């Protein structure tokens, strides 16, 4: 029966990992604002922060706030299994990561330089703007832009 009043404690427009998330979305979904977090990740990183999912971002006061930020930056240290993570077995280090908000496009652009530089097929196509997963081109990917 959470009719309750929630006076100006309700933190509007919060910002996080060099991003902004609107306080009016339910927490688990309000988080997905951030490149790197999906609905399935933002479900359980919020489970391990004792977050009342029933609530949303203007609520969930600043201690639970950095109580989730840290589970996110070290997911492997909060009972989050490795498969759940986006970057595993890195290829230069060999740990298990989750590249995150500004760092996703960085280490993706790194992954493309990575094999453009080694001049291998996948990379060549990435450089040509062509399509790299073996699909047909005769018909599809029209209006190239």
């Amino acid at each position: 029966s959470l009719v309750v009043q929630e006076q100006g404690s309700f933190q509007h427009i919060l910002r996080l990992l060099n991003t902004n998330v609107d306080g009016n979305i339910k927490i688990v979904y309000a988080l997905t604002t951030i490149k790197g977090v999906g609905r399935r990740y933002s479900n359980l990183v919020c489970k391990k922060a004792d977050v009342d999912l029933h609530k949303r971002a203007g609520e969930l006061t600043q201690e639970e706030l950095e109580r989730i930020v840290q589970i996110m930056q070290n997911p492997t240290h909060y009972k989050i299994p490795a498969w759940f993570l986006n970057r595993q077995n890195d290829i230069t280090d060999g740990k298990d990561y989750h590249t995150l908000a500004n760092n996703v496009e960085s280490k993706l652009r790194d992954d493309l330089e990575r094999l453009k530089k080694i001049r291998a097929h996948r990379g060549i196509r990435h450089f040509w703007g062509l399509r790299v997963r073996g699909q047909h081109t005769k018909t599809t990917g029209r209006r190239r832009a």
Binding site: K116, R119, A120, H121, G123, I124, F127, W128, G129, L130, R144
Partner: peptide, 30 residues
Amino acid sequence: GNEGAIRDKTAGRRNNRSKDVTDSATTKKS
């Protein structure tokens, strides 16, 4: 090899879209 292609400029995609399409590609019914 691949380096012969990758940095072979003039062969990507706006080097295609630059040129119009040969107007004999909508023309049939012999």
